[PDB]
Write an enzyme that holds these catalytic residues in place. Structure first.
Site, PDB file in Angstrom:
ATOM      1  N   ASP A 126      -6.446  35.890  91.683  1.00  0.00           N
ATOM      2  CA  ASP A 126      -5.070  35.480  91.451  1.00  0.00           C
ATOM      3  C   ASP A 126      -4.337  36.486  90.579  1.00  0.00           C
ATOM      4  O   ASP A 126      -4.468  36.456  89.357  1.00  0.00           O
ATOM      5  CB  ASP A 126      -5.081  34.107  90.776  1.00  0.00           C
ATOM      6  CG  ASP A 126      -3.702  33.568  90.519  1.00  0.00           C
ATOM      7  OD1 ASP A 126      -2.740  34.137  91.055  1.00  0.00           O
ATOM      8  OD2 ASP A 126      -3.592  32.558  89.787  1.00  0.00           O
ATOM      9  N   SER A 178      12.152  44.484  94.654  1.00  0.00           N
ATOM     10  CA  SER A 178      12.335  44.896  96.035  1.00  0.00           C
ATOM     11  C   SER A 178      13.764  45.389  96.245  1.00  0.00           C
ATOM     12  O   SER A 178      14.707  44.917  95.612  1.00  0.00           O
ATOM     13  CB  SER A 178      11.997  43.739  96.981  1.00  0.00           C
ATOM     14  OG  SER A 178      12.333  44.056  98.317  1.00  0.00           O
TER      15      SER A 178
END
EC number: 3.4.23.22
Length: 330
Positions: free
Chosen positions: A35, A199
């Site tokens: 994770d 992004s």
């Protein structure tokens, strides 16, 4: 040193991926959920409340000759999906794919929430976010990666998750055969303890690319792609019959519909998520309504590039003094 381990989807939908981890001496092998959105290595154990164990493999520290109680230490964690666990702490030898850390904090669960009990395939979590998020008290503990880092050939790990198939976590090296083209690296902020990056935009199917900054986290422990409601609405508007269902808790669509791809920007580079990766199957057995793999992050407080996004790329988690993230197509 290096390590290399195969990671395997827990079910036919890629709801999560499990990677075998050797703990203690002699080795006890548990299947952990790696994770990159958390920083505790915790396991089902001989100390877990019996009624809360249902098929999981447990770590038994009393059977490990290298296990040592971390005296006075406790831990307690709650995750974005509302699940939680807590307990005490041992140090022990932990190996992943040939790479060994001695003195790793192994957090032994005394209590786990129902979603963990109900998932027989996950024996615990191995956190790979920054150690600043580790919940051990009074002395915060380091992640497996942080402990291994100095010994690694290069201070990196990579995630190469498969679509409906196994993939690979590598530590200490970049497998140049595992991706196409080049790796585009992008800046990371560690201020929230996550692999947080920005992004450069998105496209839906064959549509034109929209240049827009989307701050989010690269999180292997989250199944879906969670993005701003504007972006998500633009995606599902291109799927006939799709709708946001408050009763279901997100966007659903008829399985007779064709899903467009979703492209996200990494610098000037582009990662394309195929439409099929966005199908998470019937909301309930026999239903004609399918759950979508791109959902709104509104009210999470952060955008999450979870497995839906990451499995479309070869991802480098670069733990150099100034951490960065790399993405390549594959």
């Amino acid at each position: 040193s290096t390590g290399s381990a195969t990671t395997t989807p827990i079910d036919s939908l890629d709801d999560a991926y499990i990677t075998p981890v050797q703990i203690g001496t002699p080795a006890q092998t548990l299947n952990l959920d790696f994770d990159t959105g958390s920083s505790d290595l915790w396991v089902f154990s001989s100390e877990t409340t019996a009624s809360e164990v249902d098929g999981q493999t447990i770590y038994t520290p009393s059977k490990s000759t290298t296990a040592k109680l971390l005296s006075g230490a406790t831990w307690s964690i709650s995750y974005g999906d509302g699940s939680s666990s807590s307990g005490d702490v041992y140090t022990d030898t932990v190996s992943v794919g040939g790479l060994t850390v001695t003195g790793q904090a192994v957090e032994s669960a005394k209590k786990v929430s129902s979603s963990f009990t109900e998932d027989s395939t996950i024996d615990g979590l191995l956190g790979l976010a920054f150690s600043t998020l580790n919940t051990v008290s009074p002395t915060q503990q380091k992640t497996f990666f942080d402990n291994a880092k100095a010994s690694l050939d290069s201070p990196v790990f990579t995630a190469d998750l498969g679509y409906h198939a196994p993939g690979t976590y590598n530590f200490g090296f970049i497998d140049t055969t595992a991706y196409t083209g080049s790796i585009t690296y992008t800046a990371v902020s560690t201020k929230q303890g996550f692999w947080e990056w920005t992004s450069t935009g998105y496209a839906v199917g064959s549509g034109t690319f929209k240049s827009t900054s989307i701050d989010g986290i690269a999180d292997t422990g989250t199944t879906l792609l969670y993005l701003p409601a504007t972006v998500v609405s633009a995606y599902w508007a291109q799927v006939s019959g799709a709708k946001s269902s408050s009763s279901v808790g997100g966007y659903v669509f008829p399985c007779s519909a064709t899903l467009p791809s979703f492209t996200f920007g990494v610098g000037s580079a582009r990662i394309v998520i195929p439409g099929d990766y966005i199908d998470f199957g019937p909301i309930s057995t026999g239903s004609s309504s399918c759950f979508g793999g791109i959902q709104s992050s509104a009210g999470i407080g952060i955008n999450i590039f979870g497995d839906v996004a990451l499995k479309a790329a070869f991802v480098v988690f670069n733990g150099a003094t100034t951490p960065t993230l790399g993405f390549a197509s594959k």
